[PDB]
Design an enzyme around this catalytic site. Structure first.
Site, short mmCIF file in Angstrom:
data_model
loop_
_atom_site.label_atom_id
_atom_site.label_comp_id
_atom_site.label_asym_id
_atom_site.label_seq_id
_atom_site.Cartn_x
_atom_site.Cartn_y
_atom_site.Cartn_z
N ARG A 137 0.67 -1.25 -0.05
CA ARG A 137 -0.05 0.15 -0.16
C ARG A 137 0.97 1.09 -0.08
O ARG A 137 0.56 2.34 -0.27
CB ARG A 137 -0.97 -0.03 1.24
CG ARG A 137 -2.28 -0.97 1.06
CD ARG A 137 -3.15 -1.11 2.03
NE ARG A 137 -2.56 -1.98 3.00
CZ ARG A 137 -2.93 -2.05 4.37
NH1 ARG A 137 -3.51 -0.74 4.97
NH2 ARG A 137 -2.50 -2.96 5.05
N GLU A 145 4.91 -9.40 18.75
CA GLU A 145 3.72 -10.15 19.43
C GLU A 145 2.61 -10.36 18.77
O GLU A 145 1.90 -11.59 18.94
CB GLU A 145 3.39 -9.28 20.76
CG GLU A 145 2.44 -9.91 21.57
CD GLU A 145 2.20 -9.26 23.05
OE1 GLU A 145 2.73 -8.09 23.01
OE2 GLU A 145 1.60 -9.77 23.65
#
Ligand SMILES: Nc1ncnc2c1ncn2[C@@H]1O[C@H](COP(=O)(O)O)[C@@H](O)[C@H]1O
Ligand SMILES: Nc1ncnc2c1ncn2[C@@H]1O[C@H](COP(=O)(O)O)[C@@H](O)[C@H]1O
Lengths: 177, 177
Positions: free
Chosen positions: B64, B101
């Protein structure tokens, strides 16, 4: 000339991504400001001389088509709609999942990306077999949009992408085997 | 104002791609010619007022970021270099494979994309945790390139992307939670 600036900015890599395949890299076009401008200008002047003001939107293809879509649209004073690889766009989408002989053409588009009757020009960096652009044309057709033409910087003519796209018109700046 | 044209062209999708996540879609910016032009103009005027003529190249992020990179580079009269998802670029590459994470930041860049000392501004559509842009900054650093700043249209401030990028400067047009 303008075409010369594009011609001298294509780099070829043997055996990528698989052996026997010559990869045509449009990176030097992007890196050279004059070359990128020349490429956009050539595409725009062709589309304007061919379609006048009947083009509503430019459709750029994930991912290398995204490099030319917006700029080409801006040059024509038009907006740019997105056709992405599958699983990338939010909201209701249409899918086109093709299995060709030497690869897969798997794209998607938002169902509200276009209204019926709207006219669109598809752009990618390179046309090979045509499986990718054909899949894009299918998606647009199912939105009842009209595909005026497909365009690219590079065309690999021996792969017969043009015949596959027919009767949808096609135009490229540079042609290789 | 110019910022208003960008502000009113962001669409939000709940629970995409995973539950609990609000997807910010910059598609309406691309579809609106005035909005896209305003976004590029705002980014360019910031970069020119901040860095003057010390920027050598713009680096757009797959995928993008490819939508804004070229146009932003052209506005500044600069070339655009590519930082891609892994396995996409031909020739010798550097890889940055991060496991954060809540996701992975896995990018690559050609080893000859930049010369040591050259100054670059990174652009993507949205900054979240900053894992992606940080990976991009790492690649550029290993080419001995200088990252002057990272920019985006949208910034999710609660994810603390700015702190992660520090001391590399950051600028965004729109800020959400
Ligand atoms: N030899 C090549 N060099 C660079 N890109 C290619 C090559 N062959 C196919 N592609 C890419 O494949 C897509 C279209 O291929 P195709 O569906 O066969 O016409 C576009 O994203 C092209 O850039
Ligand atoms: N809530 C979101 N809406 C749209 N794109 C996102 C969102 N969160 C992360 N991204 C994408 O993830 C990449 C950077 O995220 P991050 O590495 O966490 O800063 C960019 O490609 C962003 O567009």
């Amino acid at each position: 000339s303008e075409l010369q600036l594009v011609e001298q900015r294509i780099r070829s890599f043997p055996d990528f991504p698989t052996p026997g395949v010559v990869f045509r890299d449009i990176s030097p076009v992007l890196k050279d400001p004059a070359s990128f401008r020349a490429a956009i200008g050539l595409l725009a002047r062709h589309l304007k001389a061919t379609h006048g003001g009947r083009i509503d939107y430019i459709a750029g293809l994930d991912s290398r088509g995204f490099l030319f879509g917006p700029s080409l649209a801006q040059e024509l004073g038009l907006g740019c709609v997105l056709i992405r690889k599958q699983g990338k766009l939010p909201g209701p989408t249409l899918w086109a999942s093709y299995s060709l002989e030497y690869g897969k053409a798997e794209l998607e588009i938002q169902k509200d990306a276009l209204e019926p009757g709207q006219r669109v020009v598809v752009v990618d960096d390179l046309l090979a077999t045509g499986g990718t652009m054909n899949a894009a044309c299918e998606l647009l057709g199912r939105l009842q949009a009209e595909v005026l033409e497909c365009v690219s910087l590079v065309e690999l003519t021996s792969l017969k992408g043009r015949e596959k796209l027919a009767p949808v018109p096609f135009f490229s700046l540079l042609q290789y085997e």
